[PDB]
Amino acid sequence: TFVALYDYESRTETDLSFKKGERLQIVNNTEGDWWLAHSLTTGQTGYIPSNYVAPS
């Protein structure tokens, strides 16, 4: 259960854009600074910038 501190604007279809306060279910966070998050609001996959999210 992570939270995107800032709004992220996905630049490709392989990532999901979130907003400040949007909850994102982290998935894979062992590759680099970007992890695969799953939006629970609609239910879609989309990488995410770890520098914009934080562990709550």
Partner: peptide
């Protein structure tokens, strides 16, 4: 907020 970082690794 910081500048968008490099996606994990550079393509290959």
């Amino acid at each position: 907020a910081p500048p968008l970082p490099p996606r994990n690794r550079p393509r290959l």
